[PDB]
């Protein structure tokens, strides 16, 4: 019970070892105001970082961001921010920690970011980020970027039907498998000969060069 | 016999045979042993042609890195299962630091005592 007296004996009888020793021994009597402060003078900044990041005290672990700026602290803080409304930080550390599909999910469902998502997956070309973008391409139409996000998302029919009409027909056939060969030009062109845009269908029929 | 660390993957402790009475499958693991299988049959009654019901087709395969475990108390179980977690994975908190630094008033029968496989004897020298 002499947390005080044992603590002053825990500075005067050590350089490092009894600092951490009495620090975890003060964890045996739940004195954070002494064990935590003699974590840093015992080099137990990991323990102080965990304790500060876990008890909703990310500002106290902000000095310990400087040596652990990892996902387990920054993304945990961002997830708490997501819980309490700051989903900007949530998607920011999602992008820091590679939660890219949730980055674009927050883009298109929480952050209201069409064009951050439309460009970041024009770059990334990931799967479920482009799926959130395929939802948003079902809500908007960027360009060949939009057909990108429809096609690498499994949203086959949407880019398909836009190609059946709209000029985005070569880039649809491109990003489904490929649009460079006479065989694919013939087959997607026959799709157009059945489903409108016969003009450019016969045009690439001629680009087949029979 | 593997203490899977939740961080660094599967980390292995020992290769303990199941071959305990024609046993080729481990169906469980109690505290002092591992509950492996056995041949499933009906024992004849002793001294007669009758058949006693079988006791259990479950061979309790004694576990080998855990020495002084099974004849001993259950402070042994915690202490040295924890030490063998420190064996396969590699740690120091459980068998030593978690039991020093808590203000735990007793005199245990086995604070920890197989702990020499991580090279420490005093926990089997002042407890034992």
TrEMBL record, chain A:
<protein>
    <submittedName>
        <fullName>Intraflagellar transport protein 144</fullName>
    </submittedName>
</protein>
Automatic annotation (TrEMBL), chain B:
<protein>
    <submittedName>
        <fullName>Uncharacterized protein</fullName>
    </submittedName>
</protein>
